[PDB]
Design a protein around this nucleic acid. Sequence first.
RNA 1: GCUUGAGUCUCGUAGAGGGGGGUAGAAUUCCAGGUGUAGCGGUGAAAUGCGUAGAGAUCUGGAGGAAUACCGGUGGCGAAGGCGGCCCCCUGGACGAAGACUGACGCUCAGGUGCGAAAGCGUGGGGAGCAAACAGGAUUAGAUACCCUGGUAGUCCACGCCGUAAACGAUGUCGACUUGGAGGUUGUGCCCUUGAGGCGUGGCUUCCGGAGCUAACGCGUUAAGUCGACCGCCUGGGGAGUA
Lengths: 55, 65, 116, 100, 351, 65
Amino acid sequence: MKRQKRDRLERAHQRGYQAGIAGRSKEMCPYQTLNQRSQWLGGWREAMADRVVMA
Amino acid sequence: IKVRENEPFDVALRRFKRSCEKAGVLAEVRRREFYEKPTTERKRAKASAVKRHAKKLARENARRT
Amino acid sequence: RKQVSDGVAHIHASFNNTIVTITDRQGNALGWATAGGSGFRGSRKSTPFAAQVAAERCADAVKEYGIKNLEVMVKGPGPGRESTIRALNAAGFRITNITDVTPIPHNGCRPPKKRR
Amino acid sequence: MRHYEIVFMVHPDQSEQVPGMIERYTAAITGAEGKIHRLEDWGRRQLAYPINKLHKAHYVLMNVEAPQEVIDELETTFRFNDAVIRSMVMRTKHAVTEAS
Amino acid sequence: ESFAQLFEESLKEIETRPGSIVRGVVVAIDKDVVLVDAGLKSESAIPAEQFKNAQGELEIQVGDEVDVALDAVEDGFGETLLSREKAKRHEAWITLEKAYEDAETVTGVINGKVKGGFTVELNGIRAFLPGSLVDVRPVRDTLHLEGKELEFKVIKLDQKRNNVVVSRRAVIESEDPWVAIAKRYPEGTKLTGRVTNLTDYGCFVEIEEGVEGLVHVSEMDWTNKNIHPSKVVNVGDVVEVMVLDIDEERRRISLGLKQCKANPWQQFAETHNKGDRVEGKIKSITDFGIFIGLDGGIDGLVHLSDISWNVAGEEAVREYKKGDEIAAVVLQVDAERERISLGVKQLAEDP
Amino acid sequence: FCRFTAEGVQEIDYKDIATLKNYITESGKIVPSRITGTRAKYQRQLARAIKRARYLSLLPYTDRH
RNA sequence: GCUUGAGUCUCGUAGAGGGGGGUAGAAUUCCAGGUGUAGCGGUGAAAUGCGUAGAGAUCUGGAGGAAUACCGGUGGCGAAGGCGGCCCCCUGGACGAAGACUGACGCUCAGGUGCGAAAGCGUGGGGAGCAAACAGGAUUAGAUACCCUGGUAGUCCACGCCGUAAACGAUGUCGACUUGGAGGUUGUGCCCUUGAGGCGUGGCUUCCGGAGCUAACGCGUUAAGUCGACCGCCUGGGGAGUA
């Protein structure tokens, strides 16, 4: 029973990456703080390219 | 599309303009005549455009952060 | 075998397969290799890696024509289409220019209805 | 009367008959009480895309004022000629001067 | 009566829209907010950074008067655009006097060309000019004592977009943006541009006479994704930017900003990358195959588990070094592409 | 943005390809009025001029001819 | 009698409004030829299918049909249905500025007449692509289905018929009056067009909201607010828009 994994910083990354790949071209389900919204959108734009490379 | 230039070249410019207009019109035209839902999808797209613009505009008050 | 100098590398890059046809300037083929014939089968054809192995297995078996430099035409909105030209920068060729010959009709014939 | 803005392109290696062609065509218009307002020949220039496996056509701009039956007979004579590739007749309303 | 009507047209007569009439008296100072009252609706929330002069500290106490600017009214609550731009008009007037004077004499000191014209700075502000303007002839101020004192003799100004190249040393010697968009083009012409609004993907620096630039989020710094541009640069500030791309159709000049501390990273690869220089560096997070010392200005991932001692595989760096400690580590490799320096720790005295 | 046809007193002729090539892209496609910022009337006159110049081969349809 | 309602005339203005004719480019398919050889195609995976009789790819030429990328705009025009390449011919309507003219010539309208998406029917052509029916392969416990491979009517044109649609704004037409804001489009007037400028003025249109209304949702000067004229329609659900 221990402490949270990668304290929302690069978990905010992979939430934006999974949400980037599975459609959701909103870019309008992020966090609201800056240090987590910045890389929710960072994972989103890193997921658009990984959508172009596949189907 | 058409990229030819001097020795640093060949990838970024091309995947940019290629990727945008190519993947747009081919991913559109690849099936589905539809005849009816470009009307619905443009109507929903542009109603979502004005709802996003006014929604962010009146959402520019405060957020208690 | 003909001792050609330059060639034109057509890359058909559909969804389910990539085939790579290296021809000459004239437009008649010298050698081709596909993403299906490189051991990858079915769904595995539809990857960029099978396109890369296809561009390798074309870029040799066009060695006997002695091509130093080639253009690259790419047709098709597929999952290859960029790994297969990284695999032609890396295969020992000089890329003259890269074009796009993806056929965009000024809408003519009717597409199929396919999905539900 | 009606105004027209005829631009017709000419097959290139038959372009020495063009000063004859202009004289026959504006002679045909002038033989029916019609004015003329422009004569601008642009010479042999480069086609943007090959028309019948062929580049570099010779363009003639006329921009005449003439009646309808004369302009119709004129357009049929642009049809039934292998020297003329892509004629064009255009709108009415107050014919004009130097363009390029 | 008509006292008030006359009073109104009087007060119309004794104010104007731009930052022209030096009228706002500074009626409260608190770091970091100045505030005036130039006879408008409310009181400006002024930054402190429109009012400190050339070395960082404030210059104006209570009662002091600078005009601000106008033509923008009510964003919810408040009044102005900043008085610092005010200042720009004054600079323009002096430049006009020189052009008007036939010449303008001040001091111009121009060390180098970001984009082909030495940079000249007048008083607080620094401006960029085209390459010829810095020197009258082919003299070149690179051999001159650094940041030398002359004046500026004007060579060239662009009259719409504000770029002015001025004449150092040699005292004796005396529709519209988009057709010819080839001036700042050619690959990397550096520009000095004020940022306007940072749209959480971008920063929107745009200065050169009615254009739009982005510098979006990917460059901006030497970290990619976690950056959030509001933290990293500014709001309303003139910066280092150059074109990197101009698209003729679609009208999107895509500028950049990483063309800076990129050089620092290169120096780190070199400076200490000459051979096998030793470095005193602090580890930050040990990730089971290394220790990740990251001292020396953003140089990223470093020492691997393979050296660490004179035993190879069994070591598990958390057991052997520390958390957050400055160590011996020397360079052993800088890879120019793919941004991997690979330091080591086995270079010590045990065998 | 600005409408250059509104800055003039023009009514768009199809023969000044020096101006019309500022409004085709390098793939032959007509550029939108949200990009160029022309007025809608001169946008319609612009589109008819582009298509007419394409018919007289003063402009290309695509870049694959 | 009168001119405000209505209508006519002189200038323009924009528009996928309609009918007929012609023409252009890209693409799909096929045919002939060249190079070349082991796969292609397809899926969530597969197989049916096509290919050593030379396919798929690539190039040259030709034929034929259909639709008109970009512009494309909660843009435009039309009574509604609806109408998108470009050009010509014939033709309807709307709008505005300044005047002149007629003098209530107006509104609505049961019956009637006309127009009326798609499917379909008849006659004659045409047939690229797509695609009911149909065949086959899958999937499934079954699969007369969704998925795949093919594929005929039909989709197209000319002339007739049918006369229905979630024919929808689920809102009959005409007229008057009643706080605002942000836009789009289209004219026009004045002034410093001296600068994409400022102040008004008409038409059509999109959204948000005020009072008021409504069972609420919501409507809100283009009303579902306040009224007037005329018409159509409703009277529990099923049986039944059936006999």
